[PDB]
Every structure is written in C-alpha cells, then in structure tokens.
Symmetry: D2
Subunit: 116 residues, 4 copies
C-alpha cells in the first residue's frame, strides 16, 4: 500500500484543506530538485497514490504544499509562499510515511507519522 501520503488541515475553519496543490521532488545527484509526483488534496484533505513502493527509493525528498493559493482562494492574505517539507526516506524503519500539515495564515506545523 502507498508509501507516501499527505494530509492537510485548515486551522481557521477546522476542516480538511481541500484542493491544495502538492508537488513532490527528489534530490538529484547534481543537488537539484527533480519533479517526482504531484496532486491535489481530496475533500478529506488527503492525497494518496503519489508513488509506489518500487519507485520510492531511499533519497532526499521535498514535499511542497501550495498554501498561498489555498488562502488566496479563501480571500485571506497569507504569509508563506508554500510549506516545504524536506526529509530523507529510508528502508530499515516504518514503511508508510504520512506528511501532515496544519495550516494558518501566518503559521503552519508539519508532522511525520512513520508506521508499518
């Protein structure tokens, strides 16, 4: 089952953050960021199916959550351009990665839930 999931919540409305664009990148050997996967959060604030076990190999990944566009669509002026979560994915440890983000106009928190 999916090894990388993203969950986004809205701390102003107390709801999933719906239709949030999410872009994932993998760090290339020349230290640049290579597009890897993308999607939009669902009505439950979740984004599944970004990648597969076969392709999600060890390496450094960046998950960019397009928070600015989200707040603009709600008519709220935000601080950040996006929320960026940068981490190393590794094999000897819990398999499923869930990247959770809690959004406010001038603040955000992000948490990783790593389980098998």
């Amino acid at each position: 089952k999916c090894p990388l999931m993203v969950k986004v919540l809205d701390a102003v409305r107390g709801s999933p953050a719906i239709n949030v664009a999410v872009h994932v990148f993998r760090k290339a050997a020349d230290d640049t960021w290579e597009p890897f996967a993308s999607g939009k959060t669902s009505e439950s604030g979740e984004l599944h199916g970004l990648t597969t076990e076969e392709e999600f190999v060890e390496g450094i990944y960046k998950v960019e959550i397009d928070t600015k566009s989200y707040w603009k669509a709600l008519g709220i002026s935000p601080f950040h351009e996006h929320a960026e979560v940068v981490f190393t994915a590794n094999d000897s440890g819990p398999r499923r990665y869930t990247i959770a983000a809690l959004l406010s106009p001038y603040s955000y928190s992000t948490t990783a839930v790593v389980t098998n």
Copy 2:
C-alpha cells in the same frame, strides 16, 4: 456514526500515541465537571465510540488527555499534567468532531476537525 473522536500523535517518535488515557467531561448546571466518557487510544492513536448521537447534546465538554503518564512510560520527563481541550458542542454545524492532539514533552498542539 460516532460524533466525537480523539486522535493523538507523538512528535518525538513520529508515531501514533498508543494507550493514552482520555477522559471526557460535560459541564453541569452547577458549573462542575461531570464524568461523561473515557477510553485508551488504540494502536493507531485513535479513540472511537466514546458516545452516541443521542447522548452528545449541546453543552460544554472537556477532553482530558493524560499526557504525563504517556511520557513517563517512555522514560521522558514531561511538562504538563495533561492536555485539556474545552469546547462547546453545537447542533447547527458539521456533525462529526475530531479532537486531534500532537504531543511533545514540553509542548502540545490541539486542533478540531468538524465535518459532516
């Protein structure tokens, strides 16, 4: 389906917070706190089945999460006695309440996800 759910995460280990005691109270007419429901978080960090739609009427509720005992069992010295979430439950609005808590030894955050 269940109108009050609790989800607890551990920000040190990146995992659900398992076997965390949770006590819910309702505010009585004499302004005291009346025991209402309790349980222990599951292996997924979740506590379901605390109450039913029929009994969960409008009023002020307190959800106490016994964080101190959780950290002590992990051998970590914590700051808080517990995390307390106090809110009014109301009928004209999203039906399902999810009280989420993210735990660290000297900090915690709590968020409400209200949906129907």
Copy 3:
C-alpha cells in the same frame, strides 16, 4: 526576576495577541483550584508581573488563556472555550516559566520554556 510569564501570538494575523485575559489557579490541599493570579496580555502579547518568587511555591498550577473572548472581539467564532495549561511548578527548586501559546480559531499550541 519574573518567575511566571505568558506570551500569546495570533496565527491568523501574524501578530501578538493583545488584551487576552489570563487566569492562574493553584491546586489546594483539598484538591480544588484556588485563584492565584490574573491579568491581560500587553501590546507585545506578553503578561508579566503575575507573581513573585516568594508566593510562587511548589504546586500544580493551571494557566487559563481566555481565547474565545479574544476571537469573538475579532468577529471570529472559535472552537475552544479557552486554552488550559496545567503543570507542576518548582518541584525541584525554583524555576522561571514562560508559557507560550499560538492561537488559531480551531487550533492552538502551547509550549513551556523553563529556566533556572
């Protein structure tokens, strides 16, 4: 020289949370919450001068931050009644405590900074 300080920030506006009422209680020998100190946050979101080292003895304290009133004055209907921070203080000799809170309408986080 202030042993107990409270700092509150607004995650919607990216500013200190001004004029937030704060009530402090201490658990008495008969297990009730006795009023200990109160005040309001300043223009900087800070509340100083609640107590003195002499009066701030060992005990279990509860810091109640009146978030609901804060949001109502901004025209926002928030989820929580207040943020409650409960902790044992000075059980290993005197310490200085800063209780920080970050507020959003449906979420808040609280951290403690403890120094000798």
Copy 4:
C-alpha cells in the same frame, strides 16, 4: 531596528534551541536562490543582525533552519533535513519580521510575527 530575526525553541527540552545554523536566501531575477545572510542562534535561541533595512529589499526570501544537525548533536535522529520558511518580504513597504520555529524530532511549526 533589526528587520529580520529568527527565534528557535526545543519542544523536547523546554528550552531555546542553541547554536542552530540558519541560512537565508533571496530569489534572484533569474529565479535562483542567492545567498543573502547566515548565522547561528544564541543562548537565548535568537539570531539577530542578519541584515539591515537598506539591504533587505522586496523579494522572496527563504530561511533555512538546520534542524537535522541540531538534533544529531543531541543524539536524536530526526525526520526533517531542515525547516524551510519561504515568504515574500517588504512588498508593501518595509516591515520587521520575526520567524519563530518550534522543534520536535518528527515535527516542527513555524510562525511569522510581522510589524510596521
């Protein structure tokens, strides 16, 4: 008089996060990240003196907080490589920015306090 300040707290120890490396970048006209300023947090968890009002012109800035190195020195293997805070600055005239970060091994939150 400092227009850009960084404050970092440790949610495990309940203390300022000391000696945390911070790198600031500004997006150049060719869309690359140009080095802008860097430093390390003090005993109070604060980093001041990164720039001057004159040099801190309008632009998109990225504040990279080197959290992984911080946790490794404490013997903790954390999830994130660093915390990245990306924002447009001074697009409506000069402002003063405080970028605050609260760190846990598998979680972090960042807030901005912006004043005129």
